[PDB]
Design a protein around this ligand. Sequence first.
Ligand SMILES: Cc1cc2nc3c(=O)[nH]c(=O)nc-3n(C[C@H](O)[C@H](O)[C@H](O)COP(=O)(O)O)c2cc1C
Ligand SMILES: Cc1cc2nc3c(=O)[nH]c(=O)nc-3n(C[C@H](O)[C@H](O)[C@H](O)COP(=O)(O)O)c2cc1C
Lengths: 217, 217
Amino acid sequence: MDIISVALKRHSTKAFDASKKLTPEQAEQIKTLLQYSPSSLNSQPWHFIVASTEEGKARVAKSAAGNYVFSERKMLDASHVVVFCAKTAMDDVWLKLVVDQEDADGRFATPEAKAANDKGRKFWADMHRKDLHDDAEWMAKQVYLNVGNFLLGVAALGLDAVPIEGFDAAILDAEFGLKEKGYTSLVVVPVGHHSVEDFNATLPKSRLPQNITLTEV
Amino acid sequence: MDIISVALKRHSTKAFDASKKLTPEQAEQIKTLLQYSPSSLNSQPWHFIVASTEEGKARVAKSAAGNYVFSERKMLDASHVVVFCAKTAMDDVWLKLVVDQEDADGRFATPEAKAANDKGRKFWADMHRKDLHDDAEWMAKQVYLNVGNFLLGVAALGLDAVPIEGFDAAILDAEFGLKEKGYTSLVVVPVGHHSVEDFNATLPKSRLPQNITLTEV
Ligand SMILES: Cc1cc2nc3c(=O)[nH]c(=O)nc-3n(C[C@H](O)[C@H](O)[C@H](O)COP(=O)(O)O)c2cc1C
Ligand SMILES: Cc1cc2nc3c(=O)[nH]c(=O)nc-3n(C[C@H](O)[C@H](O)[C@H](O)COP(=O)(O)O)c2cc1C
């Protein structure tokens, strides 16, 4: 439609139709949206677990325990469930994985252009890893950037979704052995189609007036 | 043209056409995208500065100093420059500004439900400020979610934009007297139309293969 209509009609789904699945085209498009999100320095400090099977989602919903239990039925009833992960540290091999891939895609005309882009990227990586000591919080911010991108992208595809912070990230890091590969769960986003028990599909949307949140200068 | 064509054709603009400005409809649409972004608990832990005048951009461009001087020129040539700000602490009055706004929009059928909604939001807010002590970083992540949704929304509006971390947020907090109001600069996003000197408009996009970043389960 209009991208403003999409932003105004999308909502966090509270109940999913377990009968409605993603089309096989949609199942690949959402993978495109995770991949092609922008990131600072093109660092791409992230990993995704896309659970489509009942066996794989039951593994994710293990994280909806304790205080987060009202999040399990959303992870189980949705068609596909995306887990957004962030790197736990920025290492030079990942920095090298990015520039060597930028080179493979023809972003550099000469090797010397590749080395100044490699060197300049480490100038600002080091300002996070070595100086401010905040590369973990920094990389976690780029993954949230991807979520906002992803939530409006699956909405524009005609899909319902909910972002979830109401999950145990220690349980979900363990189930998929994430900490040892160098990642951490941040947001879990189930995607699919809502059901009649989605009570939020029948409510109006609320936001604060721009006269509170926005300043024109 | 779908949202996947948009996600694949958008780019970070490195040079803007200073003659190409946003239409007055576009200038209100980008304001909607900032307002209607989703947030955890609908906390909306945000503030935006939209600079459209030459003085207003030049005040923002004050933050492009030192190591960030190569950012000044984008902030000046763009049509509109949006500064994304995050709250420095989650206060109980803001939580109530939200509950009271959800009520005014008719999201509650009874007063008891408004108090249970209030009760649920403080159970989870206190888990950030009082238990985990990370509400400042928690709230900064929702702002980064908004940026990621903002970038893909203006792309679908037909606009070129660049997200910026290369700026002094202490200069930019001071220039707008933000720190005393309870806010901090995070990302600066100039929006508009690119110029021929945008070297990034003529390069291919690069992302890591899904076989490295993505796991299907
Ligand atoms: C980072 C983040 C985490 C969220 N976590 C949850 C969650 O755990 N459970 C839930 O029901 N909704 C969750 N939401 C959805 C918000 O409650 C919702 O976006 C907010 O009320 C705005 O409503 P909307 O989705 O209709 O725009 C989350 C949203 C964000 C941005
Ligand atoms: C959080 C964030 C901060 C960024 N800051 C800058 C910046 O300071 N200067 C700049 O030239 N580009 C900046 N970028 C743009 C990145 O270089 C760009 O997203 C990356 O190269 C991916 O390329 P793409 O925008 O064409 O998809 C930033 C991007 C993000 C997501």
